[PDB]
């Protein structure tokens, strides 16, 4: 009737944790000329076999609003963008007064022809040049005459992006380092917070396109059964409402003008690439959304919001007036940065047909203050040629603001709100393979990794090797990957050192001389080896775990030797 | 070098009696040189009392 | 003084290097620093009073 502690190595027990993740890309996905801004050449090529092990009898609490993976992805995207722009031309000589004339189309001065005096590569020669700029890039200086300055030159240094750096989003996979795993929620209509029943284990996640846009989510992924309204509290209108669509809505954005690309040499080894002449007429950049498809998209959204917000009248408003970078829809495609008024999409009351296409006006801005940050700015060089965007609308970010009505507006906060839309299904967990259980002695279908997590302690103990095998295996990703590898090695070696002290370094399961104390768990073996999962068992003895290890070191080898 | 470690410390009261004022001269975008403008009050020597 | 003229002067360090200005937000107040042994090594301390 006496029980003794037994040490099990390879236990399918995991706990919520934060850790540095690494990137993977599908093949090189470059021609050696694009030099993608996301540094995809430094990522590990993906494994063609995605694994994907469904965990039976595992229900796990997920919370998309406290997911460390979102904060880490946002940090990595900012770090990569800063590292990419760093080795490029700094446009410090351009904080000069611009003499700008309005360009008369054959808009109302949207393109200005600005002349200015700058140095050449020879420093002692001063050249008068001209360039075309968008109205949003030039701010009046002093009075209302033709004198202008660049929007941010007075407070920060504008860095010209290197013309060889592509901004095309390419799907990026975030794989966890050895010793950690990513759990995926496979529920068809997941609320975004709460227990998930269909949980699978996957070392990497699907490809995520790091698309930078606001108000409307582009590309990414769609819902499987219906439009899902996520949000956090819903009563508190301060929280962002993330809307995932079932079907995509095609959005055809374009810039019709055919500008030239004039290279103005600024100094030794440095050139400014700007817009030269306009070939053809001047036509407004715009975006086409099918009217009927958007109509049904809002019909589905209003139905779901009405269900969530009780039977109130839903009214959609456009954003307030203000700086285009704040209040307009924004996106980058083709290498060009578009800002669109987005006022024809949220202008209706649903309660309880002039044209079939919604054409949104858009503007182009070359000086972009991205990531809601000031003190740094980028100049976007001209692309040359017409731009065809042809993107998919797959989700919305809505915010909420009194006669029995609720007002929703396009909006959202920082870019983390977009990453949640893709990361809502994933959680990062740390593996702790070493567990202890009572046994009577003194001193299968090949389920995949953690497939026994929902199994009883018995039968789960027959898969210790499956979990055991997954403990192993100068830029942003290089050093982080090296740190992850060293830390995984340290974790493995620490577990091996503990087993070596216990004398179990060569054993997956070892029985010690320490008797089981009934104060730890006054339960029979049938009450422990059946019914309980390893997760429940580690929870029940968590507050006593440190005591058991002490006895093993205090006894066994310390005396047996 | 002879390092002398004392049994008891000796209190040293050092003062810079002048107040001055601080002015910013801009050098470039977002950056400035910080220097003294006009001295307020009398000119008194900085000194230490032991 | 950079010339016989008794009204011409230059920064003391200018002629040899570019002078870096300390950021005013940086405090120079000393804070206790402890050195800790890395894994594989140990730090011994002598407790002899004299």
């Amino acid at each position: 009737e006496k029980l003794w502690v037994t040490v099990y190595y390879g236990v399918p027990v995991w706990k919520d944790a934060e850790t540095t993740l690494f990137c993977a890309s599908d093949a090189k996905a470059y021609d050696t000329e694009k030099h993608n801004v996301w540094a995809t050449h430094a990522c590990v090529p993906t494994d063609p076999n995605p694994q994907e092990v469904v965990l039976e009898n595992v229900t796990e609490h997920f919370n998309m609003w406290k997911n460390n993976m979102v904060e880490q992805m946002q940090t990595d995207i900012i770090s990569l963008w800063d590292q990419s722009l760093k080795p490029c031309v700094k446009l410090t000589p351009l904080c000069v007064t611009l003499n700008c004339k309005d360009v008369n189309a054959t808009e109302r001065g949207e393109i200005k022809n600005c002349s200015f005096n700058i140095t050449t590569e020879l420093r002692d020669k001063v050249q008068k040049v001209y360039a075309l700029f968008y109205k949003l890039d030039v701010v009046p200086i002093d009075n209302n005459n033709t004198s202008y300055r660049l929007i941010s030159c007075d407070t920060s240094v504008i860095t010209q992006a290197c013309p060889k750096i592509s901004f095309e989003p390419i799907p990026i996979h975030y794989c966890a380092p050895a010793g950690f795993a990513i759990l995926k929620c496979n529920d068809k209509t997941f609320n975004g917070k709460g227990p998930c029943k269909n949980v699978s284990t996957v070392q990497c996640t699907h490809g995520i396109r790091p698309v930078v846009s606001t108000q409307l989510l582009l590309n990414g992924s769609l819902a499987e059964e219906e439009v899902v309204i996520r949000s956090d509290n819903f009563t508190n209108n301060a929280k962002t409402i993330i809307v995932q669509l079932k079907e995509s809505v095609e959005i055809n954005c374009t810039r019709p003008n055919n500008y030239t690309r004039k290279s103005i040499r600024i100094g030794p080894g440095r050139a400014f690439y700007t817009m030269g002449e306009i070939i053809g007429d001047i036509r407004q950049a715009h975006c086409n959304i099918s009217r009927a498809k958007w109509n049904d998209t809002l019909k589905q959204i209003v139905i779901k919001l009405r269900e969530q917000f009780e039977n109130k009248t839903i009214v959609f408003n456009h954003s307030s007036g203000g700086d285009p970078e704040i209040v307009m829809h924004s996106f980058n495609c083709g290498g060009e940065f578009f800002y669109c008024n987005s006022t024809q999409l949220f202008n209706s009351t649903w309660n309880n047909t002039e044209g079939n296409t919604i054409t949104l006006p858009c503007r182009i801005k070359q000086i972009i203050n991205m990531w809601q940050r000031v003190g740094q700015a980028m100049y976007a060089p001209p692309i040359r040629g017409q731009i065809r965007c042809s993107s998919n609308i797959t989700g919305l970010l809505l915010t909420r603001d009194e006669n029995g009505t609720e007002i929703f507006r396009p909006g959202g906060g920082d870019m983390r709100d977009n990453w949640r839309s893709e990361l809502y299904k994933y959680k990062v967990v740390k593996i702790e393979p070493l567990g202890v259980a009572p046994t009577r002695c003194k001193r299968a279908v090949r389920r995949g990794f953690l497939g026994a997590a929902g199994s009883t302690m018995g039968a789960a103990s027959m898969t210790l090797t499956v979990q055991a095998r997954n403990l192993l295996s100068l830029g942003v990703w290089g050093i982080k990957q090296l740190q992850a590898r060293v830390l995984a090695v340290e974790r493995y070696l620490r577990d091996q050192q503990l087993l070596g002290i216990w004398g179990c370094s060569g054993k997956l399961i070892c029985t010690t001389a320490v008797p089981w104390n009934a104060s730890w768990s006054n339960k029979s073996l049938d009450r422990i080896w059946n019914n309980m999962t390893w997760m429940e068992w580690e929870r029940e003895i968590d507050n006593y775990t440190s005591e058991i290890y002490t006895l093993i070191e205090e006894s066994q080898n310390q005396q047996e030797k | 070098t002879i390092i002398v470690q004392l049994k008891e410390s000796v209190e040293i009261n050092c003062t810079r009696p002048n107040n001055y004022t601080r002015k910013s001269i801009r050098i470039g975008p977002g950056r400035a040189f910080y220097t003294m403008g006009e001295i307020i009050g009398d000119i008194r020597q900085a000194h230490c009392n032991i | 003084p950079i010339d016989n003229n008794n009204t011409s002067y230059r920064l003391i360090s200018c002629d040899t290097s570019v002078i870096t200005q300390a950021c005013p937000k940086i405090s120079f107040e000393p804070i206790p620093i402890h050195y800790c042994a890395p894994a594989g090594f140990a730090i011994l301390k002598c407790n002899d009073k004299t």
Partner: antibody, heavy 123, light 107 residues
Framework: QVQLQESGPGLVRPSETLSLACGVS????????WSWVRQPPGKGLEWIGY???????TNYSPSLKNRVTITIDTPNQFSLKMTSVSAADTAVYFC?????????????????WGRGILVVVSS | DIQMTQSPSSLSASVGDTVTITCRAR??????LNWYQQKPGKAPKVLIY???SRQSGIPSRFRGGGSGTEFTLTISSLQPEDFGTYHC?????????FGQGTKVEIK
């Protein structure tokens, strides 16, 4: 330690021009963004506008842009001239210094405030 | 012209507890949010600069934090002198608007 002090009339008529001076004591009008902020009674703070110190360029809040002129009249004083006042403009007006140089403690916050002058618009 | 909402609009607490004040921007602003303390009859004092950092001379009890649209000011071990109206300010985009402010009373 630079201090600022507002000076001006307490009452202005509903159709006259309001002129408020801000003196600088232990300092001068150096290369910071010198600005004015309004506090209507019972309300939060409203920005009026700022003027630079490196040059004479100014930047006013759009909603008051056509009603506000800010100039510097001497190294130790600058002033706010707000035309076409109305009853809605009754407020405590604060003078302050907006620090923009990053290497200091206020990377972007009004860091030296005055004491505040109450201006009442009435007949 | 980003509009700011602060919550709660009226706050009270005993000496020594830990309290929070939430400031919400209509639009995302990164970390460019300041916090100020205005005592009755006096001009406001700067407490928090870019969302999380403190002004020298302000005790560690006043901690900030947050980014994007949700910012908080946490006042631990609240003392009798920490009475007055707290304001948040947007440094991201001109006009640098302010919230209406939350009054903190001592009980």
């Amino acid at each position: 330690q630079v201090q600022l002090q507002e000076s001006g009339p307490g009452l202005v008529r509903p159709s006259e021009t309001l002129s408020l001076a801000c003196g600088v004591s232990y300092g001068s009008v150096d290369h910071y963004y010198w600005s004015w902020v309004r506090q209507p009674p019972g309300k939060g703070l409203e920005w009026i506008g700022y003027i630079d110190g490196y040059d004479g360029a100014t930047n006013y809040s759009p909603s008051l842009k056509n009603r506000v002129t800010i100039t510097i009249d001497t190294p130790n004083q600058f002033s706010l001239k707000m035309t076409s006042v109305s009853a809605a403009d009754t407020a405590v007006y604060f003078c302050g210094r907006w620090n923009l140089y990053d290497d200091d403690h206020a990377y972007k916050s009004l860091a030296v405030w005055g004491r505040g002058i109450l201006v009442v618009v009435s007949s | 012209d980003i509009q700011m909402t602060q919550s709660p609009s009226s706050l009270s607490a005993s000496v020594g507890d830990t309290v929070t004040i939430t400031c919400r921007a209509r639009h995302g602003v990164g970390e460019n949010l300041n916090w100020y303390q205005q005592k009755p009859g006096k001009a406001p004092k700067v407490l928090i600069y870019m969302a999380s950092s403190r002004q020298s001379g302000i005790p560690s009890r006043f901690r900030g934090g947050g980014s994007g649209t949700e910012f908080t000011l946490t006042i631990s071990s609240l003392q009798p002198e920490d009475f007055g109206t707290y304001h948040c300010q947007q440094s991201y985009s001109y006009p640098w608007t302010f919230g209406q402010g939350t009054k903190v009373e001592i009980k």
